[PDB]
Design an enzyme around this catalytic site. Structure first.
Site, PDB file in Angstrom:
ATOM      1  N   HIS A  41      30.687  44.228  47.013  1.00  6.96           N
ATOM      2  CA  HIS A  41      30.442  45.199  45.954  1.00  6.96           C
ATOM      3  C   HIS A  41      29.507  44.666  44.870  1.00  6.96           C
ATOM      4  O   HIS A  41      29.326  45.334  43.845  1.00  6.96           O
ATOM      5  CB  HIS A  41      31.768  45.684  45.344  1.00  6.96           C
ATOM      6  CG  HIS A  41      32.378  44.745  44.346  1.00  6.96           C
ATOM      7  ND1 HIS A  41      32.133  44.835  42.991  1.00  6.96           N
ATOM      8  CD2 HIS A  41      33.268  43.734  44.497  1.00  6.96           C
ATOM      9  CE1 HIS A  41      32.820  43.903  42.356  1.00  6.96           C
ATOM     10  NE2 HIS A  41      33.518  43.222  43.247  1.00  6.96           N
ATOM     11  N   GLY A 143      33.154  39.801  35.317  1.00  6.92           N
ATOM     12  CA  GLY A 143      32.245  38.791  35.815  1.00  6.92           C
ATOM     13  C   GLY A 143      32.884  37.717  36.668  1.00  6.92           C
ATOM     14  O   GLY A 143      32.163  36.852  37.182  1.00  6.92           O
ATOM     15  N   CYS A 145      34.483  38.085  39.541  1.00 10.26           N
ATOM     16  CA  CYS A 145      34.515  38.383  40.967  1.00 10.26           C
ATOM     17  C   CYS A 145      33.776  37.321  41.771  1.00 10.26           C
ATOM     18  O   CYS A 145      32.772  36.757  41.325  1.00 10.26           O
ATOM     19  CB  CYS A 145      33.913  39.762  41.230  1.00 10.26           C
ATOM     20  SG  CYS A 145      35.005  41.112  40.746  1.00 10.26           S
TER      21      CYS A 145
HETATM   22  O1  LIG Z   1      39.198  41.237  37.051  1.00  6.16           O
HETATM   23  C1  LIG Z   1      38.289  42.048  37.062  1.00  6.16           C
HETATM   24  O2  LIG Z   1      37.374  42.227  38.180  1.00  6.16           O
HETATM   25  C2  LIG Z   1      36.474  43.279  37.776  1.00  6.16           C
HETATM   26  C3  LIG Z   1      35.054  42.737  37.727  1.00  6.16           C
HETATM   27  O3  LIG Z   1      34.281  43.478  36.777  1.00  6.16           O
HETATM   28  C4  LIG Z   1      35.064  41.263  37.339  1.00  6.16           C
HETATM   29  O4  LIG Z   1      33.950  40.603  37.951  1.00  6.16           O
HETATM   30  C5  LIG Z   1      36.918  43.679  36.396  1.00  6.16           C
HETATM   31  O5  LIG Z   1      36.344  44.635  35.673  1.00  6.16           O
HETATM   32  C6  LIG Z   1      37.949  42.963  35.992  1.00  6.16           C
HETATM   33  O6  LIG Z   1      38.557  43.067  34.813  1.00  6.16           O
END
Ligand SMILES: O=C1O[C@H]([C@@H](O)CO)C(O)=C1O
Ligand SMILES: O=C1O[C@H]([C@@H](O)CO)C(O)=C1O
Lengths: 303, 310
Positions: A41, A143, A145
């Site tokens: 994604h 951020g 992910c």
């Molecule tokens: O834990 C999370 O994963 C998604 C992504 O945006 C983080 O990279 C998001 O919004 C969170 O709060």
């Protein structure tokens, strides 16, 4: 002595974390040999995540659309393919810091270390467990992910988790390193329901054994219980059924302390019904279920 | 979202851990430049720890009595000296993995990551705090002496603790990297008492601020209290006094949340007396006091540190 939520040293994993950018979306990637693994994604915007079609969004992309940065040396993408929910980008340079590694899929109840990363840079490391409903109670901001969960078995790094999503109830979902989600979750921002979260019984007992090794004994009693007699009470309190397999797994801790598993099972059951009465076990007012029997062995003995 | 006992990334410190063996005693050493730092009781046996004179035991040693192993290179010791309770061994090779480092002495209440080591190999990392009684509630087994505690600024490792011993109550004592023990403890097998430990008040407030950042707000009230009025109640519950300094440190969290420090103090006062009433804050039924205000800010803001890719 002493007992702590201990994570594995993160050095070997720090050398594999890269920044992967596609458009205005930036998240972390795992750089092993000449392949960079990251959540698929990354090719989505926020509006895209409402109902993404990964078939189409990927056909519209080329190698030059993926910006991979290791520190701030820019890795050149020479290939891209999709495996379930992870994107695999082949780069022109093999990671010289690649360790002995392995891709594993863990069972609910098992634990692993998470290296929290932002923009490919390490932020912190912590321990957590794969819940019975296949979520994890981690610490992830926007951020994060692509951050990975791992164990280090002697000299091999076993990668077992890649972070993908934060659900609306605050828990987190992700995949193994082959792209298959743990649990019934999907990489789409939508209403997603997790199963009832239950307590990992065998972990509580292992942790109770860690307590007794550390001088906390007030919860031991004189009753004894059996397998069927323990489970009928356990599941009224949302506890996983305890199997004969578990009883064997707790064997080494039983031997080290001289307290049989079924004696300890009688104690927990007691704690379940009466509570803790303002007392504490290993610095906690709750029963901890994120230490596996193996975890207790490492801290109190040594694998 | 979510909040966890987060330790610093340990990579920069992993490259500095070596094995130090002297006689039948083996423990860990910290290898920075061409000096190896380790606890000085590596030179004692169990019989010597009863009442050791380290001046003597060191005079009866010379360089070839210290075996330092980094991975599978044997480091050659070319000098040895004692600084308080740490032994400094100069080796013939500078550690190519030396980062910006700094030797600091931390205050009670401050936190740091510990890299648990055995035979010079890192086994695990965890976060902990210097208790007000100058002990730490660590997790250490036999052979762990010489394990170090540290903070990272961005690429600079601030070394602040070296493990020396376990007290009979199961807690741990050690020194800074200059050899001075935290607290009244000594490196001899003798009767040593840690003393009554208190709760780190400013850390609890920091953690309460972390909770409201995460959506937990049930403990907030409409009241405000005064520093003097809060301390009168706090110190009846074995809480450290909250000073104007502490109130200042909580300033950034106060601004981020829109809750004055003394407002949060009014919430803490209530929780101290009445309890949590079967509820939990950040997954805990107890008031957590091992997160500093700085610990909350970076973890809630995602501050990163220098990775190995320069
Ligand atoms: O834990 C999370 O994963 C998604 C992504 O945006 C983080 O990279 C998001 O919004 C969170 O709060
Ligand atoms: O912290 C510790 O110090 C002693 C020492 O014997 C280890 O070298 C010990 O057993 C611990 O758990």
């Amino acid at each position: 002595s002493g007992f702590r939520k201990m994570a594995f040293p993160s050095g070997k994993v720090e050398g594999c974390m890269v920044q992967v950018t596609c458009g205005t979306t930036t998240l972390n990637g795992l750089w092993l040999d000449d392949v960079v693994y990251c959540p698929r994604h990354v090719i989505c915007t926020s509006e895209d995540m409402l109902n993404p079609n990964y078939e189409d969004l990927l056909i519209r992309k080329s190698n030059h659309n993926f910006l991979v940065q290791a520190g701030n040396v820019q890795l050149r993408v020479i290939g891209h393919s999709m495996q379930n929910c992870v994107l695999k980008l082949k780069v022109d340079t093999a990671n010289p810091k690649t360790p002995k590694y392995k891709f594993v899929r863990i069972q609910p109840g098992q634990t692993f270390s998470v290296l929290a990363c932002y923009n490919g840079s390490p932020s912190g490391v912590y321990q957590c467990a794969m819940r019975p409903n296949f979520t994890i109670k981690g610490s992830f901001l926007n951020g994060s992910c692509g951050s990975v969960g791992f164990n280090i078995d002697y000299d091999c790094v076993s990668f077992c988790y890649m972070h993908h999503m934060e659900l609306p109830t605050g828990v987190h979902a992700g995949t193994d390193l082959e792209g298959n989600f743990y649990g019934p979750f999907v990489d789409r921002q939508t209403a997603q329901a997790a199963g009832t979260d239950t307590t990992i019984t065998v972990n509580v007992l292992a942790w109770l054994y860690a307590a007794v090794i550390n001088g906390d004994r007030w919860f031991l009693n004189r009753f004894t219980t059996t397998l069927n007699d323990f489970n009928l009470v356990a599941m009224k309190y949302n506890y996983e059924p305890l199997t004969q397999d578990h009883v064997d797994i707790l064997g080494p801790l039983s031997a080290q302390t001289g307290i049989a598993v079924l004696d300890m099972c009688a104690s927990l059951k007691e704690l379940l019904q009466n509570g803790m009465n303002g007392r504490t076990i290993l610095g906690s007012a709750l029963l901890e279920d994120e230490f596996t029997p193996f975890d207790v062995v490492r801290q109190c003995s040594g694998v």
